[PDB]
Design an enzyme around this catalytic site. Sequence first.
Site, short mmCIF file in Angstrom:
data_model
loop_
_atom_site.label_atom_id
_atom_site.label_comp_id
_atom_site.label_asym_id
_atom_site.label_seq_id
_atom_site.Cartn_x
_atom_site.Cartn_y
_atom_site.Cartn_z
N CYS A 194 0.86 -1.19 0.00
CA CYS A 194 0.00 0.00 0.00
C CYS A 194 0.92 1.26 0.00
O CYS A 194 1.46 1.66 1.03
CB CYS A 194 -0.99 -0.01 1.18
SG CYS A 194 -2.09 1.46 1.08
N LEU A 195 1.12 1.84 -1.18
CA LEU A 195 1.98 2.99 -1.39
C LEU A 195 1.34 3.84 -2.48
O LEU A 195 1.08 3.34 -3.58
CB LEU A 195 3.38 2.49 -1.81
CG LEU A 195 4.44 3.53 -2.12
CD1 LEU A 195 4.66 4.38 -0.86
CD2 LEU A 195 5.74 2.84 -2.57
#
Length: 152
Positions: free
Chosen positions: A90-91
């Site tokens: 999750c970026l």
Amino acid sequence: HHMNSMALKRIHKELNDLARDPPAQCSAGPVGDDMFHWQATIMGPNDSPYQGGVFFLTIHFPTDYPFKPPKVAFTTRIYHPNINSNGSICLDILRSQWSPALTISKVLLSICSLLCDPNPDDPLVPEIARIYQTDREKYNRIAREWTQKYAM
């Protein structure tokens, strides 16, 4: 006619730039002769509970790179709020905040930054986010335990 090789040329450029100025903890390059499928390795950042760990990733560039982000996943298990047991990361820059101005070196540097500075308010692993928020000493101890269990 046209040659349709501008993604390949960009990826080659990025690979040559990576060799000349590597993001410090990281290696990456093509698996074999397929420039669109890379492997990478990230040594746990030194001021992080992952120090000593060696983490493997896969990188898949899209055919219309740089206009869509590479797909990046961990293959090594890690105790982190933003990386799940499927290796999903999750970026923001790998999702809504990708720009064609970015490069794979920028992506690798940002993953390293994430390892040092998690985003627990946007978790993929809600328990690990909770421990990060409420008891950082415990988070660091468990993250060291998991580094030894899976990444050494």
